[PDB]
Amino acid sequence: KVFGRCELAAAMKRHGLDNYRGYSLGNWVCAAKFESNFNTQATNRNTDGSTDYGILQINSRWWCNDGRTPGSRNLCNIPCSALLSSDITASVNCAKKIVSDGNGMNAWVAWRNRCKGTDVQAWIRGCRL
């Protein structure tokens, strides 16, 4: 499916991502918007020959298993297709896991470039969260 800002924002907060490891909700609603265009079924290949899945574009190099990346580590132990359903439970569980590791939300290259250090509250302005 494709979410509207507030509709997403609400689900994300509901799952417990608002101030997860210090990142305001905005940072995540911001990420989702650039990563996938709020689009649950967004799939994009990378230079590596890995693939980015789901509303947050978790890649099949490390986190999920798309049964075609060789050298796949599958850290979330989830078939990548599980990322692509209307319910974001899997995406969010596998996001809490990624950010908790090393480089924080620097992992998402369209958060580094597009969101980081911008009036990020914007993305939740005019939603009753």
Swiss-Prot record:
Binding positions (substrate): D101
Molecular function in Gene Ontology: beta-N-acetylglucosaminidase activity; identical protein binding; lysozyme activity
Compartments where found: Secreted
Protein name: Lysozyme C
Native organism: Gallus gallus
Main location: secreted
Record CDD domains: LYZ_C (cd16897)
Gene3D superfamilies assigned: 1.10.530.10
KW Hydrolase (keyword) present: yes
Disulfide feature: C6-C127, C30-C115, C64-C80, C76-C94
Keywords recorded for this protein, A-Z: Allergen, Antimicrobial, Bacteriolytic enzyme, Disulfide bond, Glycosidase, Hydrolase, Secreted, Signal
Tissue specificity as recorded in UniProt: In the egg white and polymorphonuclear leukocytes.
Active site, renumbered: E35, D52
PANTHER family in UniProt: LYSOZYME C (PTHR11407:SF28)
UniProt family annotation: Belongs to the glycosyl hydrolase 22 family.
